[PDB]
């Protein structure tokens, strides 16, 4: 109406428990990487903000240089002061490009590490069913042996 031997079920309890512990350690390693990667991506995103803010002040300096130079530089017979002012301004422009280049390099790392993040989470989500099935199976075999009246000390040695 209401729908194998102990040593054999005890052997499979030991196996399934060992498989479960192993699959837990695996998942745990991935959750370190997931957490570590989340902290690195966040740090890279703030470092990108730090680049943007660094470039913003360089572009204000350019604006300052062009406004402040012009209203002064009409004083021409010193063609000498003028070339010094311009070369200095070319030197500033040249340095923005280095900073822009560095910001772009970091944007590429983050693009790569964003993809690593998504793989870890993918590999995490293909391990969960195994892990959960392996826990529920382990628990089914415990429940069976406890019902059969197997002593806690025999169960203990199969869980180790």
């Amino acid at each position: 109406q209401q729908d194998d031997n102990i040593e054999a079920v005890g052997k499979k309890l030991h196996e399934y428990n060992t498989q479960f512990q192993e699959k837990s350690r695996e998942y745990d390693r991935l959750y370190e990487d997931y957490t570590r990667t989340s902290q690195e991506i966040q740090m890279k995103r703030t470092a990108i903000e730090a680049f943007n803010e660094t470039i913003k002040i360089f572009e204000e300096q350019c604006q300052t240089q062009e406004r402040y130079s012009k209203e002064y530089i009409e004083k021409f017979g010193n063609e000498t002061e003028i070339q010094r002012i311009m070369h200095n301004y070319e030197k500033l422009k040249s340095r923005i490009s280095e900073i822009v280049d560095s910001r772009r390099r970091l944007e590429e790392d983050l693009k790569k590490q964003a993809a690593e993040y998504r793989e870890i989470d993918k590999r995490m989500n293909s391990i969960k069913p195994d892990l959960i099935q392996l826990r529920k199976t382990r628990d089914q075999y415990l429940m069976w042996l406890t019902q059969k009246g197997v002593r806690q000390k025999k169960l203990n040695e199969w869980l180790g």
Partner: protein, 930 residues
């Protein structure tokens, strides 16, 4: 190497690029810049060096005006070596604090603005104003009040009439006065005596425990002060300093909702950046919640095919009307992957926003990934409401709340709830039975609900039982329940602690709980500060009562604010609380400018110690210890390092000054994480002249803190009823991501080390020669009892000679609490070699051994009386998500350890049996050795 090339941007538009030393302070860099700028165009246009301030981009991505020019470029740590000259203009005070808060709390303030979130905007506005007012108000009042704020009294839990001698001096004077006064003399009388002795008026002084910020004042006798009590006990002479009021001023100075009967519904639209098995299909299981309770049955989406951007465009309709939704209604999602089961991720959402408005329109939820736990539940109603801050990489569910009404609708005000909730021998027996003697059964629930007016009258303490029986899916039942709650009598602290649990989400319950916690003394609030911070993770909104309450106590007590800062700061790495904790730290900081300076100093010490430990970690694997040690000394001796690590208040105790690093006495321990062992000097008297800290990096210290907090609580509860078991509740403070500090107990060694038969007994003879030994055996006896009961009750196994320590005083104490709550029952444990020392080396010494048995038994008896307090505190710590404190079973372990389901005598009889068996087990263990 030393030098770094620095870009200098001048206000004329001119740009210089020259090298400077990393170690050079910004004042030194101004001079070199001016010296080189004079050989560059438009120099003559510039004002003087002192007319400009350097601006950089710091590590938190914010612009920082560097007003303190005595700071090394390497300390300033700008993003790229770029310095801009700007005017000293506008509110320099506002600009300096805003910059310091960002560096101090870890998170930059700009990251709050970037959210474009009114709820964040209103929290910052309201809470910063409130903290600034409290701090302005604080600046007015008189040095005494400010001394009560800055350095509150350290008293023995009293809050013997002997007499003893006390060394006293004055501020800025080598000469001193020794003289006898009574154990029961109030501190003013000590002041008057040294005033007359100076001459041969006195209320404009205070007494400073010197080499320390521990002050003696107010209406309390000398023996109730911890410094005195400690000094009396050791037989050492206290050393004080008279300090004049003016020297303390020196420090101070520098449509209706119930009309909408249409059922509640959402449009599930799309998923986003999903990462899953191509072969499988994706499901979104959805459910409504209030605390733990389902408000109605769950509803599911159709099985769409697995892809990054799954599309449903579905409608989900719930077995509940809009008019029924309680204030703290919580829509809870989980993305599942199925064949033809895998929890992917989850996200919860409050249905009413922070201003009480029912939410309408598109909402985009950035999900948290699901963890497989034992419970294996479908949804995660206990989870945070805050969106995942990883908004670029993280999965997300786009959904649409429908436009339910032409005018926008709010949850009704209190007056409209009182209106609806106003109008409504034999049965006493069934209620009495049910309440008096934890989960009720639905037959009981409708009785309690019927006799709810009787519960308020005769069982006020049963409010918690009554709140759960309430049907929060029915607005009539909610209105009736809240009507009672507004007239409910004040419950004691113990009851109010229970109401802060996640089972009680309603704001009127939290409000009522906080009303009943407002009677906590600062001492008692300190004992529960760790649990009250974790409970913030269950909060729905940012502006909540428990946050206002904690900021009130932090602004009124500097010690409370110190430990509030560090409990929040040490979780700023944790995405789910970073935003919430960040805003509280900003508000705290704005009401605490003085302590900001102390915490800045402490933050840089820790930053240097992280860098230092990372050097030592590497070297350990490269080379043997003596030369790694000498390389650590070289690295510490560097100007920047040494200054950062010197002259700071201890994070472990702000009243303790870590003054001078003792480099040759500094080392690290052979543990996995190579924790640094830093030694310090001070202007203290004797034993406290030298102090030490362990900086640990790589382990979780949270387990040890909780354990030590609970041993500290036990010690207070014991001391409160006139039993001192000579415990050593050393400081433990998480400061950061898998980082914190441990207070070194000096003049202590591990039992393994001392055992290199009567090896402990000898070690005590050599440390307590002649007539001191009887004390040292009593210290050992009393402490052994305390740690025997403590480790039993908390379920702390793996206790061995490598993790148990003796103080030269004789006191036993434990360290490295890895495990607790069994993680099978840990038996009560007697060690033969400790029984040996207790018995005074004798095989048989019944007289003594019975005294030890009573200490253990009295101790176990006092904890059972306060066992509900332990349960409630442990219940709230489930919020922290420690592995070993996850669930009802972990809580259950304490009920069984303390045997709270048994009468006092029955409990004491069971304890005795366990005692006796542990004694018989004591022999059988020791018999097996070589």
């Amino acid at each position: 190497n030393q030098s770094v090339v620095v870009d200098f941007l001048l206000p004329t538009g001119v740009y210089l690029n020259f090298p400077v030393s990393r170690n050079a302070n910004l004042s030194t860099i101004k001079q070199l810049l001016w010296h080189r700028a004079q050989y560059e165009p438009l120099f003559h246009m510039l004002s003087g060096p002192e007319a400009y301030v350097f601006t950089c981009i710091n590590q938190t991505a914010e612009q920082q005006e560097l007003e303190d020019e005595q700071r090394r470029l390497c300390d300033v740590q700008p993003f790229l070596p770029v310095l801009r000259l700007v005017a000293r203009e506008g509110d320099r005070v506002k600009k300096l604090i805003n910059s310091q808060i960002s560096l101090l709390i870890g998170k930059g303030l700009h990251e709050f603005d970037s959210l474009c979130d009114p709820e964040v905007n209103d929290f910052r506005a309201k809470m910063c104003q409130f903290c600034e007012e409290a701090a302005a108000r604080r600046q007015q009042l008189g040095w005494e009040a400010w001394l009560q704020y800055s350095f509150p009294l350290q008293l023995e839990p009293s809050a013997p009439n002997r007499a003893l001698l006390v060394n006293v001096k004055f501020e800025g004077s080598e000469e001193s006065f020794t003289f006898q006064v009574s154990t029961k003399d109030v501190p003013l009388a000590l002041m008057a005596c040294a005033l007359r002795k100076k001459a041969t008026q006195p209320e404009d002084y205070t007494l400073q425990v010197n080499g320390r910020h521990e002050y003696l004042y107010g209406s309390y006798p000398l023996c109730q002060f911890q410094y005195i009590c400690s000094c009396l006990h050791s037989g050492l002479t206290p050393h004080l300093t008279m300090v004049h009021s003016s020297s303390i001023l020196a420090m101070r100075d520098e449509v209706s909702l119930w009309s909408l009967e249409q059922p509640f519904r959402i449009e599930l639209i799309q998923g986003s950046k999903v990462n899953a098995d191509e072969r499988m299909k994706l499901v979104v299981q959805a459910g409504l919640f209030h605390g733990n309770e389902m408000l109605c049955k769950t509803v599911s989406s159709s099985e769409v095919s697995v892809c990054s951007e799954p599309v449903w465009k579905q409608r989900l309709e719930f077995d509940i009307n809009i008019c029924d939704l309680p204030r703290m209604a919580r829509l809870c999602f989980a993305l599942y992957a199925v064949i033809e089961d895998c929890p992917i991720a989850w996200a919860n959402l409050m249905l009413f926003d922070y201003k009480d408005q029912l939410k309408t329109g598109e909402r985009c939820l950035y999900m948290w990934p699901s963890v497989p736990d034992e419970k294996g539940e479908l949804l995660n109603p206990t989870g945070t409401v805050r969106s995942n801050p990883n908004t670029d990489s993280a999965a997300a569910l786009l959904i649409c709340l429908p436009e339910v009404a032409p005018h926008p609708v709010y949850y009704p005000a209190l007056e409209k709830i009182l209106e609806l909730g106003r109008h409504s021998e034999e049965e006493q027996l069934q209620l009495r039975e049910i309440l008096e003697r934890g989960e009720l059964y639905e037959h009981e629930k409708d009785l309690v609900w019927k006799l709810r007016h009787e519960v308020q009258e005769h069982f006020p303490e049963a409010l918690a039982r009554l709140l759960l029986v309430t049907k929060w899916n029915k607005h009539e039942d909610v209105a009736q329940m809240l009507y009672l709650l507004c007239s409910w009598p004040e419950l004691p602290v113990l009851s109010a602690l229970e109401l802060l649990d996640f089972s009680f989400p309603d704001c009127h319950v939290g409000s009522f709980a906080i009303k009943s916690l407002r009677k906590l003394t600062d001492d008692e609030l300190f004992q529960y500060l760790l649990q009250l911070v974790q409970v913030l993770k269950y909060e729905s909104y940012l502006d909540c009562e428990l946050t206002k309450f904690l900021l009130d106590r932090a602004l009124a007590n500097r010690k409370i604010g110190h430990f509030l800062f560090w409990h929040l700061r040490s979780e700023m790495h944790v995405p789910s609380v970073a935003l919430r904790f960040g805003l509280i730290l900003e508000a705290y900081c704005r009401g605490s400018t003085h302590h900001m300076k102390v915490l800045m100093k402490q933050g840089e010490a820790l930053s240097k110690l992280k860098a230092l430990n990372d050097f030592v970690k590497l070297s350990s694997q490269k080379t043997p210890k003596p030369q790694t040690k000498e390389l650590m000394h070289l690295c510490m001796r560097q100007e920047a390092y040494l200054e950062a690590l010197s002259h700071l208040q201890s994070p472990l105790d702000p009243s303790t000054l870590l003054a001078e690093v003792c480099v040759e006495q500094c080392t690290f321990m052979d543990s996995k994480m190579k924790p640094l062992w830093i030694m310090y000097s001070n202007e203290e008297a004797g034993s406290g002249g030298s102090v030490g800290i362990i900086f640990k990096n790589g382990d979780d210290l949270r387990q040890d803190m909780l354990t030590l907090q609970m041993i500290q609580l036990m010690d207070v509860l014991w001391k409160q009823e006139g039993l001192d078991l000579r415990m050593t509740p050393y400081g433990c403070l998480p400061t950061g991501d898998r980082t914190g500090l441990i207070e070194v107990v000096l003049r202590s060694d591990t039992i393994a080390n001392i055992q290199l038969k009567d090896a402990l007994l000898n070690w005590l003879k050599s440390k307590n020669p002649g007539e001191a030994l009887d004390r040292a055996i009593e210290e050992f006896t009393l402490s052994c009892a305390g740690y025997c009961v403590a480790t039993y009750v908390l379920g702390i196994g793996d206790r061995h000679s490598d993790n148990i320590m003796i103080r030269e005083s004789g006191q036993l104490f434990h360290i490295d609490f890895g495990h607790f709550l069994g993680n099978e029952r840990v038996p009560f444990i007697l060690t033969y070699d400790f029984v040996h020392v207790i018995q005074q080396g004798k095989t048989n010494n019944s007289e003594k051994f019975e005294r030890f048995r009573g200490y253990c038994e009295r101790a176990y008896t006092i904890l059972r009386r306060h066992g509900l307090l332990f349960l409630h505190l442990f219940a709230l710590m489930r919020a922290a998500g420690l592995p070993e404190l996850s669930c009802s079973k972990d809580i259950q372990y304490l009920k069984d350890s303390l045997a709270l389901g048994k009468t006092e005598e029955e409990a004491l009889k069971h304890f005795r049996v366990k005692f006796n068996e542990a004694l018989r087990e004591s022999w059988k263990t020791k018999v097996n050795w070589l």
